[PDB]
């Protein structure tokens, strides 16, 4: 599904994110909690207030996983295998929520990547996140 141009686009955009990846991961989660309050049902043990270190901490792990996914775009099932297991068998997040976080990550990148977020890059990133989401829910049943 990811064409050579999509792959190039994602590496370029994510390259631009660079050291900010963790910051942007936290912002994406916060956007998701505010915009789509039902997703908060999965984090009852967190302080979700603005600036929460728990949210910042989780945002970094999220971003790190995405970084690993980009670096292994051609072998994503293996690189995220343990994360696929974790979501399927322990966290058990309903798959509908992955589309909500993906949208919120897109909005975050848009707000921080003025030059880089072109229509072509937008489309490639959306395809990339759907692919990641698919991998993460692949073992649910």
């Amino acid at each position: 599904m990811l064409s050579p141009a999509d792959k190039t686009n994602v590496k370029a955009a994510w390259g631009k994110v660079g050291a900010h990846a963790g910051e942007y991961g936290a912002e994406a989660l916060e956007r998701m909690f505010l915009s789509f309050p039902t997703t908060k049902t999965y984090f009852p043990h967190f302080d979700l207030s603005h600036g929460s270190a728990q949210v910042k901490g989780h945002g970094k792990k999220l971003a790190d996983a995405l970084t690993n996914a980009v670096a292994h775009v051609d072998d994503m099932p293996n690189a995220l295998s343990a994360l696929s297991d974790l979501h399927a068998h322990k966290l058990r997040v309903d798959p509908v929520n992955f589309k909500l976080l993906s949208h919120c990550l897109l909005v975050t990148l848009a707000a921080h990547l003025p030059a880089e977020f072109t229509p072509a890059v937008h489309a490639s990133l959306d395809k990339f996140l759907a692919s990641v989401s698919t991998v993460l829910t692949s073992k649910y049943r």
Partner: protein
């Protein structure tokens, strides 16, 4: 909820033939089998290792009877689902932490169970009426999330 006189009579007539305990146990069981991530709230129920274990789990049957009983009571208030389920909505959000997507999943499993149970009597128009009702109930249970 807004249904026509025809739709409402079709729902009520079929429901009179339903064993709420049996159907509720079946619908919850199939939810946990068909969409196993929904098992996340029920670890305290014990053995959910296989379909037969789920379907024969007495705590599954007990919970199934309890939620379908509340559903069943809902059918008497099709004109005020929102108000009827307001406090249950709060409870599922604030204390139980149940993603409302689960209510939609249960709704669709319930429709399949009714079709299995009633066969040709579960005609397309009767299905259409129940589809409105289970979307109505899921919407009302989701109404107080924040």
């Amino acid at each position: 909820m807004h249904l026509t006189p025809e739709e409402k009579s079709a729902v009520t007539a079929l429901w009179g033939k339903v064993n709420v305990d049996e159907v509720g146990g079946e619908a919850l069981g199939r939810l946990l089998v068909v969409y196993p991530w929904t098992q996340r709230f029920f670890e305290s129920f014990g053995d959910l290792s296989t379909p037969d274990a789920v379907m024969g789990n007495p705590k599954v049957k007990a919970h199934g009877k309890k939620l379908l009983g509340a559903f069943s009571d809902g059918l008497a208030h099709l004109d005020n689902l929102k108000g009827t389920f307001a406090t249950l909505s709060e409870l599922h959000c604030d204390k139980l932490h149940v993603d409302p997507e689960n209510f939609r999943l249960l709704g669709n499993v319930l429709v399949c169970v009714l079709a299995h149970h009633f066969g040709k009597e579960f005609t397309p128009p009767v299905q259409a009426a129940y589809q409105k009702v289970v979307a109505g109930v899921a919407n009302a249970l989701a109404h107080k999330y924040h």
